[PDB]
Structures are given as structure tokens and as C-alpha cells.
Design a protein around this ligand. Structure first.
Ligand SMILES: *[C@@H]1O[C@H](CO)[C@@H](O[C@@H]2O[C@H](CO)[C@@H](O[C@@H]3O[C@H](CO[C@H]4O[C@H](CO[C@H]5O[C@H](CO)[C@@H](O)[C@H](O)[C@@H]5O)[C@@H](O)[C@H](O[C@H]5O[C@H](CO)[C@@H](O)[C@H](O)[C@@H]5O)[C@@H]4O)[C@@H](O)[C@H](O[C@H]4O[C@H](CO)[C@@H](O)[C@H](O)[C@@H]4O[C@H]4O[C@H](CO)[C@@H](O)[C@H](O)[C@@H]4O[C@H]4O[C@H](CO)[C@@H](O)[C@H](O)[C@@H]4O)[C@@H]3O)[C@H](O)[C@H]2NC(C)=O)[C@H](O)[C@H]1NC(C)=O
Ligand SMILES: *[C@@H]1O[C@H](CO)[C@@H](O[C@@H]2O[C@H](CO)[C@@H](O[C@@H]3O[C@H](CO[C@H]4O[C@H](CO[C@H]5O[C@H](CO)[C@@H](O)[C@H](O)[C@@H]5O)[C@@H](O)[C@H](O[C@H]5O[C@H](CO)[C@@H](O)[C@H](O)[C@@H]5O)[C@@H]4O)[C@@H](O)[C@H](O[C@H]4O[C@H](CO)[C@@H](O)[C@H](O)[C@@H]4O[C@H]4O[C@H](CO)[C@@H](O)[C@H](O)[C@@H]4O[C@H]4O[C@H](CO)[C@@H](O)[C@H](O)[C@@H]4O)[C@@H]3O)[C@H](O)[C@H]2NC(C)=O)[C@H](O)[C@H]1NC(C)=O
Ligand SMILES: *[C@@H]1O[C@H](CO)[C@@H](O[C@@H]2O[C@H](CO)[C@@H](O[C@@H]3O[C@H](CO[C@H]4O[C@H](CO)[C@@H](O)[C@H](O)[C@@H]4O)[C@@H](O)[C@H](O[C@H]4O[C@H](CO)[C@@H](O)[C@H](O)[C@@H]4O[C@H]4O[C@H](CO)[C@@H](O)[C@H](O)[C@@H]4O[C@H]4O[C@H](CO)[C@@H](O)[C@H](O)[C@@H]4O)[C@@H]3O)[C@H](O)[C@H]2NC(C)=O)[C@H](O)[C@H]1NC(C)=O
Ligand SMILES: *[C@@H]1O[C@H](CO)[C@@H](O[C@@H]2O[C@H](CO)[C@@H](O[C@@H]3O[C@H](CO)[C@@H](O)[C@H](O[C@H]4O[C@H](CO)[C@@H](O)[C@H](O)[C@@H]4O[C@H]4O[C@H](CO)[C@@H](O)[C@H](O)[C@@H]4O)[C@@H]3O)[C@H](O)[C@H]2NC(C)=O)[C@H](O)[C@H]1NC(C)=O
Ligand SMILES: *[C@@H]1O[C@H](CO)[C@@H](O[C@@H]2O[C@H](CO)[C@@H](O[C@@H]3O[C@H](CO)[C@@H](O)[C@H](O)[C@@H]3O)[C@H](O)[C@H]2NC(C)=O)[C@H](O)[C@H]1NC(C)=O
Ligand SMILES: *[C@@H]1O[C@H](CO)[C@@H](O[C@@H]2O[C@H](CO)[C@@H](O[C@@H]3O[C@H](CO)[C@@H](O)[C@H](O)[C@@H]3O)[C@H](O)[C@H]2NC(C)=O)[C@H](O)[C@H]1NC(C)=O
Ligand SMILES: *[C@@H]1O[C@H](CO)[C@@H](O[C@@H]2O[C@H](CO)[C@@H](O)[C@H](O)[C@H]2NC(C)=O)[C@H](O)[C@H]1NC(C)=O
Ligand SMILES: *[C@@H]1O[C@H](CO)[C@@H](O[C@@H]2O[C@H](CO)[C@@H](O)[C@H](O)[C@H]2NC(C)=O)[C@H](O)[C@H]1NC(C)=O
Ligand SMILES: *[C@@H]1O[C@H](CO)[C@@H](O[C@@H]2O[C@H](CO)[C@@H](O)[C@H](O)[C@H]2NC(C)=O)[C@H](O)[C@H]1NC(C)=O
Ligand SMILES: *[C@@H]1O[C@H](CO)[C@@H](O[C@@H]2O[C@H](CO)[C@@H](O)[C@H](O)[C@H]2NC(C)=O)[C@H](O)[C@H]1NC(C)=O
Ligand SMILES: *[C@@H]1O[C@H](CO)[C@@H](O)[C@H](O)[C@H]1NC(C)=O
Ligand SMILES: *[C@@H]1O[C@H](CO)[C@@H](O)[C@H](O)[C@H]1NC(C)=O
Ligand SMILES: *[C@@H]1O[C@H](CO)[C@@H](O)[C@H](O)[C@H]1NC(C)=O
Ligand SMILES: *[C@@H]1O[C@H](CO)[C@@H](O)[C@H](O)[C@H]1NC(C)=O
Ligand SMILES: *[C@@H]1O[C@H](CO)[C@@H](O)[C@H](O)[C@H]1NC(C)=O
Ligand SMILES: *[C@@H]1O[C@H](CO)[C@@H](O)[C@H](O)[C@H]1NC(C)=O
Lengths: 450, 122, 122, 122, 49, 44
């Protein structure tokens, strides 16, 4: 009757709403040729498209929050769920809780313990008198010197398979049909607020799931100025994530050339014991070049003054205290798990623009039996590695905390953070968020129908 | 692919077609690469069933006999296609969206096909 | 929703539209809430494929060129819609149901589309 | 069922219709009888989406406004249907197949439906 | 009843008013929670107080 | 093996049982007692 237009259905209109879905992984279809019996994640893991597509959306402004990002939570539970699936088929070490008779190794206060103990053979009749070599961190005495496994009173224990490797490989997160992933292309982005230039991708960039504390290793570099990120900045309870401009060369080696016993606890099962150490008598150490660490510090200390004020004193110091995972730099190199003393790097005091040799070193401790992510009921034994392990990684960022003692208007001190591994994933995921596409739409037009 | 999302609705009608489309024996992660694509085909058919039961029965664009109510975004035609964008458009209709949906399935394909059956007898 | 099942076929044509439609990581019970809905979408598409291959190509009601045989429920028209019900109706046709199905796919959309192709040439 | 695969394309149009269609709690082998039929329905819908977005919107045979290029298998009409077979036919078009696909979705249902919308206004 | 005259088939009864029933464990107990590790802990029944 | 005795009335329904048990370590056993109902155990 009254004119004019009529409703009309449009399919595929550009309308999306912020939402959450279940994301899968992608390995680049080369990681599969890397083989070594299912390295890390990739087994049936989806091959990445040789030509990923990134579409820049013009005349668009979208508001991002990285701390509210849901992609982080899936990845955190993924690595955890990934971890258990790796330890299920492997050999369980349950009857290793046998009494340990230990003694001091032939310098640096006997960090290594030579332990003799009784063990079950293939046959169920006669036991086996054999010795092994454990770090001081893996054992605890109970009251010659008698020791025991450190994890036995807390939980059970299982050995990781020598076939698989913990080597981080690039993993692309993609979204299923009907969804989309937004990417923030600005050079300077702190993870909160509106984003001027936004592009969309089916898959996120190459992300190496490197689990580390107090140091972001093998991560993505920032653009131009170094970045400063915090959930709540003025709040001293929230950690402060830092993104580096130039990568920092770091060396961590295992200056112990070792051998594998490969003792037989059959039928069919074989445990890899740590034999005698042939080589340098040394404790594990981590190298950082004095010139390269300082330059970054000088550029970073200036960025904190875009918040804490033009002029103020910023002092750095080592970890306050807590669990070993919190107080030291924890990571994996060559299959072994290093815990490094970062106290030497964080000893400095800075002026407004400045601070008042050719190398630096960091003492590292080795622990084979670990419970990360506060896991109880499952302890993983890192198998020994033949020969000396040497590794070189990039230091791409930090986890930092601010002191609560204030004296807020006087000076501020920062210390290396730890704990939550989500922050590590938030470091790479800050520029991405998940939305679902709503294709269906209605618009008024004259066509009507016959 | 979404390129006109920032552009006006009038320009957004040209690229409409691109938006339509972009061992397996594992015990675990097999459910992770499955559960995602299964709800995808469930979400896919969810939209398509609506397209059939309405006056469309076909994809892309299709029209209907439902008259546009003035009370629903009273506007200028050039104020819609030429001056306005889809994200900005779906924002206002958000209240009347469920109302419009009813007019397509009820007022049309329920009352139209029956109307058609009566017009097909003679 | 099924409300006219007791009513006559004539009254049952009005409510026809309502009948059309009404962590997930678990090792077990996940297959129990899955196997049910998967055969559901399999049973769904099973009906829809028949609807396309016949002279319908659309949902709800659609007509065909198949003449109604006298030998199939010879009746009065008012004895069907006005005096009789669907459960009672499907009961008698039970024998001729498979016969009728053949006339739709074979006698029509096989012979009709080809007929159409020949009528579309000129 | 494939019976005319050896026969000519002209004879192969008659049997076209036959080609259209032919506890579950186990931990293992349940994925073997599943993974096969799930990609089957995925492969099924993959063909059907193409049928809709093109100028078909229906199964079996359907036509289009796309003109046949001479450069694509320049031939005699009786040299195609009467003298030649499908396996032998798809062999030559193998190069132009991806080209033809573009003309159906782009040149037609993208440009046709919009053309239709403009012809439906008056 | 499935088959009433048949004495082999059970007879199911449905009440009108619900019947209040009390069942208690007049033994106030304690859990030993003995440790049969590594990681496992069994809950033994201690003395009754 | 369960070494049991009669609880301190109503004909000793509860049995106080002493037995050997495996600890966290695979070396030394554990001498501990538990309390089982008469219905959960059978003498040999
Ligand atoms: C992220 O991190 C950041 C930091 O890292 C977090 O920021 C924190 O945010 C919280 C908010 O949750 C802040 O606490 C609130 O502070 C405000 C403001 O307090 C300041 O200013 C007051 C007034 O200043 C003005 O007046 C003076 C005098 O003229 C003038 O000189 C001055 O320049 C200025 O012009 C001061 O009174 C106040 O000082 C007091 O508090 C200090 C802090 O504790 C203390 O050190 C002092 O010694 C002094 O005691 C301060 O300088 C407060 O107003 C507010 O208080 C509300 O909340 C508390 C609970 O925490 C509650 O007990 C109070 O009753 C009060 O709630 C009233 O207001 C509500 C909102 O209107 C209302 O709903 C309530 O019903 C209630 O109102 C009732 O009572 C009033 C009368 O009392 C009545 O009129 C009403 O009708 C009604 O009946 C909070 O304490 C933190 O300060 C801030 N952190 C820092 C470091 O500053 C942030 O939260 C984080 N966010 C996330 C998402 O992570
Ligand atoms: C649910 O539960 C209920 C109960 O809880 C179950 O109910 C039970 O059902 C079974 C059936 O499977 C019953 O058994 C059958 O009983 C009938 C009837 O028997 C009674 O009546 C007979 C005749 O009564 C009439 O005549 C007299 C004389 O004039 C008159 O006074 C009277 O008032 C009445 O007018 C009596 O002969 C019979 O007594 C005999 O049996 C008693 C029970 O054992 C016994 O106590 C007596 O002392 C006496 O011996 C009784 O009062 C029987 O006819 C029937 O017998 C058939 O089946 C048996 C196998 O069990 C088989 O061996 C027989 O040969 C017979 O099969 C003949 O009949 C078939 C059907 O026609 C036919 O196919 C056969 O080929 C065969 O016929 C052949 O032989 C005849 C000549 O013999 C010949 O003419 C034919 O041409 C052919 O060649 C069963 O015994 C139970 O009684 C009943 N329970 C109770 C408590 O009553 C129910 O099953 C359950 N259901 C479910 C789903 O769970
Ligand atoms: C962050 O990112 C960085 C960079 O991506 C990561 O650094 C990576 O670290 C990996 C080790 O974890 C390392 O993998 C190594 O690759 C080396 C190069 O391989 C290429 O060259 C060889 C030829 O040499 C080719 O054949 C091959 O196909 C490749 O093209 C290998 O040489 C490495 O093997 C050695 O090191 C590992 C531990 O690092 C040992 O487990 C391994 O056994 C090897 O060690 C033996 O060999 C060396 C000499 O090569 C001896 O000095 C040593 O003592 C060992 O010898 C004894 O042991 C073997 C058996 O183990 C025995 O046969 C022999 O006779 C002796 O008894 C290793 O494969 C990546 O290359 C490296 N990335 C780059 C770019 O280099 C870093 O890890 C990341 N951070 C985190 C936290 O993951
Ligand atoms: C962590 O470990 C990494 C890897 O070890 C360290 O990075 C390496 O750092 C070293 C030194 O800083 C560097 O070595 C030099 O590389 C040059 C090329 O970039 C080489 O040309 C050079 O070799 C000369 O010097 C050696 C020692 O003096 C000689 O043995 C050698 O024969 C070379 O001498 C020649 O050249 C001169 C002219 O220059 C000529 O007259 C001579 O006849 C002869 O021909 C050094 O080896 C590595 O390149 C670095 N590696 C990488 C990958 O960058 C890093 O510093 C470590 N970090 C910490 C904190 O310890
Ligand atoms: C900490 O960072 C500072 C820079 O803020 C580093 O100072 C650097 O010191 C070297 C000398 O060791 C300077 O090189 C000098 O260059 C001048 C000009 O060519 C030349 O005249 C001198 O003979 C010498 O070669 C270097 O320029 C200077 N950096 C800057 C930016 O000026 C310092 O080296 C760092 N810490 C350590 C470990 O030295
Ligand atoms: C924090 O870092 C500073 C800087 O490295 C540390 O100062 C260092 O202190 C040692 C003494 O333990 C100095 O060694 C001295 O060297 C001089 C020069 O050869 C010599 O005369 C002395 O006899 C002694 O050997 C060292 O030089 C000095 N560093 C510098 C750059 O001068 C400081 O100790 C650190 N603090 C903590 C708590 O670790
Ligand atoms: C650490 O950073 C360096 C420099 O950013 C990385 O080396 C670069 O690798 C890319 C790979 O395509 C090359 O294009 C660059 O040329 C390399 N840099 C230089 C200076 O040549 C290095 O790969 C990073 N660490 C890790 C583990 O990847
Ligand atoms: C760790 O202790 C064991 C003994 O429990 C050492 O093994 C003995 O080594 C001596 C060499 O001085 C041999 O004579 C003995 O026969 C060895 N005994 C056994 C049981 O192996 C072992 O050498 C010590 N650690 C190392 C290898 O330095
Ligand atoms: C990590 O490095 C710090 C700094 O060198 C070490 O602190 C030393 O602690 C010992 C006692 O264990 C003191 O005798 C030294 O005087 C301290 N050094 C300085 C420079 O003050 C610390 O021991 C190292 N490792 C651990 C595990 O704490
Ligand atoms: C069940 O028997 C055990 C002994 O097997 C009792 O435990 C003893 O209790 C006496 C107290 O009269 C103590 O002096 C002993 O040291 C206990 N021995 C052990 C091994 O625990 C236990 O008391 C009896 N049941 C109860 C708790 O009444
Ligand atoms: C870009 O988009 C905004 C909002 O979507 C709109 O106001 C503006 O007119 C658009 N620009 C052009 C050139 O159409
Ligand atoms: C409607 O659009 C026309 C464009 O021709 C414009 O001139 C007029 O002012 C508009 N009126 C209103 C009420 O928007
Ligand atoms: C057919 O229906 C009409 C209704 O107008 C009725 O009068 C007639 O008797 C019916 N005949 C038969 C054979 O059912
Ligand atoms: C109710 O249904 C019965 C059988 O389906 C039918 O005989 C009867 O006519 C129906 N009642 C009405 C009022 O239509
Ligand atoms: C085309 O077909 C006709 C059949 O009528 C035949 O006579 C003629 O020779 C053919 N020409 C070519 C070039 O194939
Ligand atoms: C049989 O097929 C071949 C090749 O497909 C063809 O050349 C031949 O003409 C066919 N035979 C008949 C009788 O059509």
C-alpha cells in the first residue's frame, strides 16, 4: 500500500561480533619432514598454507584487549594437554623410589651426588645393584648419607621418551569456517585501546611455543621503539611485559660431557641413567654480552619514564624469593632443563639517561625431575644427553614486577617476574583476537517479487 | 574478503561473492581438529535452512514481498546505501531483526506457498 | 508442533510450518552426545536429497505433474482432507508409497528436465 | 550405474539419474567406519555448494548464459555427443576447466542476480 | 506388573504419599589417609569415636 | 594377610586388622592397621 521499498536478504555482508571458538594448530608442513618421532606438537598437525592471506581493512577502527584475549587460554591449556599426551605412552619410573646411598663428587661444593641403590631386573627374583648420577636438586636425604627421589613424597614420576624432542617449532593458529582472526598492523601497540590499521588472517604468524621464565626466548621483535605492556600499570601486583627491539644473544651450555647407561629394567623397558662425567668439571653457565645487554637497558629504562615521570631513579635487582621456577631463569636446551642465576645482570642503578669488559656469565643449575605449571600427580624425568649441549637463542623480552613499598614519589625498583606462562603466550598473541562472522543481513530495496 | 567492511553499503555489494567462501587415527588432537570443523558445518547449515524457508531458496541476493516498515530505521534511501556502512547499519536494526525474521517465514513462505497452491489450481 | 496429528488433514495444513524445526574434550559420553546428533544430520539430508531430486526443489509444499491413480486410495476429495487424518491416511497408501516415489524422480525430474532442455533450445 | 562410461556421451544422458546415488561405542574401528563417511558428506556438500552458486540451483542438468568459446575444444556438435565419450571428453577440457568455472560464478550468478535485482525493480 | 497372575514376575508399586525414612551411620569416624606412593594415597578407616 | 581381632557388645561386628603394606619406597614394608566390617573380609 504505502510505498516504497521492501525487505531483501543479503548473504555475506561484512558483519562480525567478538566471540570465542575452538582453534586448531598448524606446523608449516616442513616440521613433518623434521621427523624425530613427533617433535613437540606436530604429528597429524595441520600443514600450513604455503601462501597465507592477509587482507587489510581500510576505513576501519577496532578496539583490542590482549589481557581479555581468549586465544591465550586455549594455548596455555594446549601446551599442558600436549605435555600429558607426550608422557602417556612413555616409560613410567615408579619403582625408582628405592633408597639412595650417595657421596660427594671429586670443587664448587659437591653439586653432584654419586648414588648406589637396589633395582628390579627383567626377572622378578634377583634385584640389581647399580649406581647412578643425580643432581643435588633431584634428590632429598632422609633421616652413611642416605637420599631419595625428591618427587616421591609429593607425587608420582614418569620418564620422557628419548625419541621425541621438546624442540619448539613454529605453530600457526587458525580459525574454522565462519570465523576470522584480526591482526593489528601498527608498529607501536600496547595491547589496549583502538587500532587504526587492522587486517584479517586465516592463520596467525609463526609462533614458537618456547616456555621460559624471566626471559622471552625466540620471540618476535618489536618495531622502532621498544614496547612496554602491563594489564594494570600503577598496580604493583600486575606483571610488566617488555618487548625488545634488537634481539639479545644468549649462550647456555652444559659443560659436562656425559654418557648414557641405558640400564635394562625389563621386560621390554629400558631406563637411561646418567653415567660418569668426562670433561670440564664445571657448573652449567649462561653467557650474555655486556655491550648488548647494556644498550637495550638504556633504551628500555627511558620508556619507563614515559609513565613514571621524566626524572626518577630506577634500580634493578634480582628475584625476591619463592619457588625455583620463579626465582631463576627456567628453560629447555637440548632436552635438559636449565635454571640460571640472573642476579648478575640485574645488578645496576640508573640515572636519568645513564648508568653509573668483554663478557658476562650466569651460574646455572640442572634438574631432571620437574613439576611445571604447579602439577601434582605427574613428575617428568628429563633423560640424559650424550656429549656437551650448546645452544644459542634470542632474548626477545622479559617478565617484570614492581615493588609495593612506597615511597611512590621517591624511586621505583623492578625485578624479574615469573609464574604464569600465559604472559609468555600473551607476548605473541597481543595483536590477535577472535571474532565470528555474521554473514546474514537485511536491507530495504524496490525489487519486491512477482 | 571483507574488504568493504569499512566502505559504504553501496560499494560493498560488488565484492559480496568473495565473502561466501574463503592419518587421522590420533587418540588426541584429532578431536581438536574435528570439533572445530563439525560445528562449522553445523553453523553452515544453520544459515542455509533459514535461506530456504524464507523467500530466497537461493544464495547471494534474493527479494521478498515483505513491505519495509517506517518504524524500522526510518531513513533516506541514499542515507542508507551511499552514506552508511553495514556494521553501523546492523547496529540500529538490532531491535527489529527478530521481528523481520518472522515476516519472512510466516507472512511469506507459509502464506505464499499456500497462496501459490491456490493460484496453481486454476 | 504436531498439534493437528489428531485433527483432520484439512486443518493440519495451517500448522505445517511449526513441524519443520523444533569442553567437548571428554573421552566418554562425548560419543553419546555426538552419535545421536550426527545421525540426525544424516537423517536430515536424507529427506532433503529426495526433495531436490523430485519436482520440489524447495521445502514445505510443492506440486508435480504426476497424475493421481484411481487404484491408489480411490476416494472422495472431501473424504480425504475433511473427513480423514494423516496417520489414518499414510496407513492405506503404505502399499503404493514406494510406487509413487518412483514416479517423482523417474517420470518427472529425469524426463522433465530433459523435456525442459529440449524446450529451452527453441 | 556408470554403465555408459564406455558408451558415447549421447547415450550416456539417459542413465544419468542412476549415478546421483548408489552399538557404535567402540574405542577403535569406530573411527575407521566414521572418518570415511564424514569426508564423504564433506565431499558431497563440496559439489552441491558449487551447484548453487552457479546458474544451476538444482541437480541433474541445468543451463547457463555462458557462451561456449571456440578456443575451448573447437569441434563439431555430432563429433562431441555422437562420436565421443566422457572420459575422452574431460581429457581435453582439462586445461579450460578452471576457466569455465570462473565464468559460471563470476560472469553469471554474481552479475546475473544483480542484473535480476535491477530488472525486478521495474 | 508385567504378568500379574504369573508369580515369577515382580510387582511394582507406586505410592501416593511419600514415606519418611531415616538411615544414619551412628559411628563417628576418622580418615587415616595412609600414603601408598609415589603420588597415591589410600583412605583407611580409623577408630570409631 | 589380615590379622584381625574383636572390637570392644552386639557380637563384634567390626574387625581390627593388622597387616604388612608397601610404602613409597620399594625397600621397606609398612606395618599398619585398619578397620573393616565383617562383610568386607573372610578368614582363611
Ligand atoms: C588498576 O590499578 C589502579 C592502581 O594501580 C587501581 O586504582 C585504584 O582504584 C581505586 C578504586 O577502586 C582507588 O580507590 C578509591 O579512591 C577514591 C578516591 O580516593 C582519593 O581521593 C579522595 C578525595 O580526593 C579529593 O578530595 C580531597 C579533599 O578535598 C582533595 O584534597 C583531593 O585533592 C581530591 O580533590 C580521598 O578521600 C582519598 O584519600 C583516602 O583514601 C586513600 C586511599 O586509601 C588513603 O590513602 C587516604 O589516607 C584517605 O583515607 C584518595 O586520596 C575513593 O573515593 C574510593 O573510596 C570508595 O571505595 C572504597 C572501597 O575501596 C569505599 O570504602 C568508600 O566508601 C568509597 O566508596 C564511596 O564512593 C563510591 C563511588 O561514588 C560509592 O558508590 C560508595 O557508596 C561510597 O560513597 C558513599 O560514601 C560517601 C562518603 O564516604 C557518600 O557521600 C556517598 O553518598 C556514599 O554514601 C576508593 O578508595 C585507588 O585509590 C586507586 N589506586 C591508587 C593507587 O590511587 C584500579 O582500581 C585498578 N583497576 C583494575 C580494573 O584493575
Ligand atoms: C502370563 O501369565 C499367565 C499366568 O500367570 C500365563 O497364562 C498361562 O497361559 C498358558 C498358555 O500358554 C496356560 O496353559 C494352557 O492352558 C490351556 C487351557 O487349559 C485349561 O483348560 C483346559 C480345558 O478347559 C475346558 O474344558 C474342561 C472340560 O470340559 C471344562 O471343565 C473347563 O471348564 C473348560 O471349559 C484343561 O484341559 C486344562 O487342564 C489341564 O491343564 C492344567 C494346566 O496344566 C492342569 O492343571 C490340569 O490338571 C489339566 O492337565 C486347563 O484347565 C491348555 O489348553 C494349553 O495346552 C496347550 O499347551 C500345552 C503346552 O503348555 C500343550 O502341551 C498342549 O498340547 C496344548 O496345546 C494344544 O493347543 C494349542 C492351541 O490350540 C495347539 O496349537 C496345540 O497343537 C495343542 O492342540 C493339539 O492337541 C489337541 C488335543 O490335546 C488337539 O485337539 C489339537 O487339534 C492339537 O492336535 C496350555 O496348557 C496356563 O494355564 C496359563 N496359566 C494359568 C495359571 O492358567 C501366560 O501364558 C503368561 N503370558 C505371558 C506373555 O507372559
Ligand atoms: C631458540 O632457537 C634456537 C635457534 O633456532 C635454538 O637453537 C637450536 O638448538 C637445537 C638443539 O636443541 C639445534 O639442533 C642442533 O642442530 C645442529 C645442526 O644440525 C644441522 O647440521 C648437521 C651437521 O652437523 C646436519 O646433519 C643436520 O641435518 C642439520 O642440518 C646439530 O649439530 C645438533 O646436534 C648436536 O646438538 C644436540 C644438542 O644441541 C645434541 O643432542 C646432538 O646429539 C648433537 O650433539 C652431538 O654433536 C656435536 C657436534 O655436532 C658434539 O659436539 C656433541 O658433543 C654431540 O656429540 C655426541 O653425541 C652424539 C649423539 O648425541 C654422538 O653421535 C656423538 O658421537 C657424540 O657422542 C642439534 O641437532 C638447532 O640447530 C639450534 N638452532 C639453530 C638455528 O642452530 C634454541 O634451542 C631455541 N630455544 C629453545 C628454548 O628451544
Ligand atoms: C655466544 O656464542 C656465539 C657463538 O660462539 C658468540 O657469537 C660469536 O662471537 C664471536 C666473537 O665475538 C664471533 O667470532 C668472530 O667472527 C668473525 C666473523 O663474524 C670471524 O672473522 C672471527 O674470526 C677471526 O678471529 C678468530 C679469533 O680471533 C680467529 O680464530 C679466526 O681465524 C679469525 O681470524 C682471521 O681474520 C683475520 C682478519 O680479521 C685475519 O687477519 C686472520 O688471518 C684470520 O683469517 C671471529 O671468529 C662469531 O662470529 C660470533 N658468532 C655469531 C653467530 O654471531 C657470542 O658472542 C656468544 N655470546 C656470549 C655472551 O658469550
Ligand atoms: C654501554 O653502552 C654505552 C653506550 O651508551 C657504551 O659506550 C660505548 O663505548 C665505546 C668505547 O668502549 C665507544 O666507542 C668509542 O667510539 C668513539 C667514537 O668513534 C671513539 O672515539 C672511541 O675511541 C671509542 O672507539 C662507543 O661509542 C660507546 N657508545 C656510544 C653510544 O657512544 C658501552 O660500551 C656499553 N657498555 C660496555 C660494556 O662498554
Ligand atoms: C654489581 O656489579 C658491579 C659491577 O660489575 C660489581 O662490582 C665489581 O666488584 C668486584 C669486587 O668483588 C670488582 O673486582 C675488583 O676489580 C678491581 C679492578 O681490577 C680490583 O682493583 C679489585 O681488587 C677487585 O678485584 C669489580 O671490578 C667490580 N666491577 C667493576 C665493573 O668494576 C659488584 O660487586 C656487583 N654487586 C653484587 C652484589 O654482585
Ligand atoms: C634472532 O634474530 C636474528 C636477527 O633478527 C635472526 O636471524 C635472522 O633470520 C632471518 C630469517 O629469515 C634472516 O632473514 C635474517 O637475515 C637473520 N638476521 C641476520 C642479522 O642476518 C635469528 O633467526 C633469530 N633467532 C632465531 C632463533 O630465529
Ligand atoms: C660412583 O660410585 C661407583 C661405585 O658405587 C663407582 O664405580 C666403581 O668404580 C671403581 C673405579 O675406581 C671400580 O673399581 C668399581 O668396580 C666400580 N663399582 C661399580 C659398582 O661400578 C663409580 O666409578 C663412581 N663414579 C664414577 C664413575 O666416577
Ligand atoms: C646467585 O648470584 C648471587 C650474586 O652473586 C649469589 O649471592 C651470593 O650468595 C652467597 C651465599 O650463598 C654469598 O656468600 C655471596 O656473597 C653472594 N654474592 C654477592 C655478590 O653478594 C647467589 O648465591 C647465587 N645463587 C643462588 C642460588 O642464590
Ligand atoms: C587396633 O589395634 C591397634 C594395634 O594393632 C591399636 O593401636 C595401638 O593402640 C594402643 C593403645 O592402647 C597403642 O599403645 C599402640 O601403640 C597402638 N599400636 C599401633 C600399631 O598403632 C588400635 O588402638 C586398635 N584400635 C583402636 C584404635 O581402638
Ligand atoms: C568509512 O566508514 C565510515 C564509518 O563506517 C563512514 O562514516 C565513512 O563515510 C566511510 N568513508 C567513505 C569514503 O565511504
Ligand atoms: C533525502 O535525500 C535527498 C537526496 O536527494 C536530500 O536532498 C534530502 O535533503 C534528504 N532528506 C532527508 C530528510 O534526509
Ligand atoms: C462424495 O462427496 C459428496 C460431497 O459433496 C457426497 O455428497 C457424495 O455422496 C460422496 N460420494 C461418495 C461415493 O463418496
Ligand atoms: C479426530 O480424529 C479421528 C481419527 O483421527 C477422526 O475420526 C475424527 O473425525 C477427528 N475429529 C474431528 C473433530 O475432526
Ligand atoms: C561436421 O559434421 C557434419 C555432419 O553433418 C559433417 O558432414 C562434416 O563433415 C563435419 N565437419 C567437420 C569439419 O567436422
Ligand atoms: C566405445 O568407446 C570408445 C572410446 O570411449 C569409442 O571410440 C567408441 O566409438 C565407442 N563405441 C560405440 C559403439 O559407441
Amino acid at each position: 500500500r504505502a510505498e516504497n521499498l521492501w525487505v531483501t536478504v543479503y548473504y555475506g555482508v561484512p558483519v562480525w561480533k567478538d566471540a570465542e571458538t575452538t582453534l586448531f594448530c598448524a606446523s608449516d608442513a616442513k616440521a613433518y619432514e623434521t621427523e624425530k618421532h613427533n617433535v613437540w606438537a606436530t604429528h597429524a598437525c595441520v600443514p600450513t598454507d604455503p601462501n597465507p592471506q592477509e587482507i587489510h581493512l581500510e576505513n576501519v577502527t577496532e578496539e583490542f584487549n590482549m589481557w581479555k584475549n581468549n586465544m591465550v587460554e586455549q594455548m596455555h591449556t594446549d601446551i599442558i594437554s600436549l605435555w600429558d599426551q607426550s608422557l602417556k605412552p612413555c616409560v613410567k619410573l615408579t619403582p625408582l623410589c628405592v633408597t639412595l646411598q650417595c657421596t660427594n663428587v671429586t670443587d664448587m661444593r659437591g653439586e653432584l651426588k654419586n648414588c648406589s641403590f637396589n633395582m628390579t631386573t627383567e626377572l622378578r627374583d634377583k634385584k640389581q645393584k647399580v649406581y647412578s648420577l643425580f643432581y643435588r636438586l633431584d634428590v632429598v636425604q632422609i633421616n652413611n648419607k642416605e637420599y631419595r627421589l625428591i618427587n616421591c613424597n609429593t607425587s608420582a614420576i614418569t620418564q620422557a621418551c628419548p625419541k621425541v624432542s621438546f624442540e619448539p617449532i613454529p605453530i600457526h593458529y587458525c580459525a574454522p569456517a565462519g570465523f576470522a582472526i584480526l591482526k593489528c598492523k601498527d608498529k607501536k601497540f600496547n595491547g589496549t585501546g583502538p587500532c587504526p590499521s587492522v587486517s584479517t588472517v586465516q592463520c596467525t604468524h609463526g609462533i614458537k611455543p618456547v616456555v621460559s621464565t624471566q626471559l622471552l626466548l625466540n620471540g618476535s621483535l618489536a618495531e622502532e621503539e621498544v614496547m612496554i605492556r602491563s594489564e594494570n600499570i600503577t598496580n604493583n601486583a600486575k606483571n610488566i611485559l617488555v618487548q625488545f627491539n634488537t634481539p639479545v644473544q644468549i649462550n647456555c651450555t652444559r659443560p659436562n660431557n656425559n654418557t648414557r647407561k641405558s640400564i635394562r629394567i625389563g621386560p621390554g623397558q629400558a631406563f637411561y641413567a646418567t653415567g660418569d662425567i668426562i670433561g670440564d668439571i664445571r657448573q652449567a653457565h649462561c653467557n650474555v654480552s655486556k655491550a648488548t645487554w647494556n644498550e637495550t637497558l638504556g633504551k628500555v629504562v627511558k620508556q619507563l619514564r614515559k609513565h613514571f615521570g621524566n626524572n626518577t631513579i630506577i634500580r634493578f635487582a634480582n628475584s625476591s624469593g619463592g619457588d625455583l621456577e620463579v626465582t631463576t631463569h627456567s628453560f629447555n636446551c637440548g632436552g635438559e632443563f636449565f635454571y640460571c642465576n640472573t642476579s648478575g645482570l640485574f645488578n645496576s642503578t640508573w640515572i636519568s639517561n645513564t648508568s653509573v669488559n668483554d663478557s658476562i656469565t650466569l651460574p646455572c643449575r640442572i634438574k631432571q625431575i620437574i613439576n611445571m605449571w604447579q602439577r601434582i600427580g605427574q613428575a617428568m624425568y628429563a633423560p640424559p644427553i650424550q656429549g656437551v649441549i650448546r645452544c644459542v637463542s634470542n632474548i626477545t623480552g622479559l617478565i617484570l614486577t614492581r615493588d609495593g613499598g612506597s615511597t611512590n614519589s621517591t624511586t621505583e625498583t623492578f625485578r624479574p617476574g615469573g609464574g604464569d606462562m600465559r604472559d609468555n603466550w600473551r607476548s605473541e598473541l597481543y595483536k590477535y583476537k577472535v571474532v565470528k562472522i555474521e554473514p546474514l543481513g537485511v536491507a530495504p530495496t524496490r525489487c519486491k517479487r512477482r | 574478503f571483507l574488504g568493504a567492511a569499512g566502505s559504504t553499503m553501496g560499494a560493498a555489494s560488488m565484492t559480496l561473492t568473495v565473502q561466501a567462501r574463503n592419518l587421522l587415527k590420533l587418540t588426541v588432537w584429532g578431536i581438536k581438529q574435528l570439533q572445530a570443523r563439525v560445528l562449522a558445518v553445523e553453523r553452515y547449515l544453520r544459515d542455509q535452512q533459514l535461506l530456504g524457508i524464507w523467500g530466497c531458496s537461493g544464495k547471494l541476493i534474493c527479494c521478498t514481498n515483505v513491505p519495509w516498515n517506517s518504524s524500522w530505521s526510518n531513513r533516506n534511501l541514499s542515507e542508507i546505501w551511499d552514506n552508511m556502512t553495514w556494521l553501523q547499519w546492523d547496529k540500529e536494526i538490532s531491535n527489529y531483526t527478530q521481528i523481520i525474521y518472522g515476516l519472512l517465514e510466516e507472512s511469506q513462505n507459509q502464506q505464499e506457498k499456500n497462496e501459490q497452491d491456490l493460484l496453481a489450481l486454476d
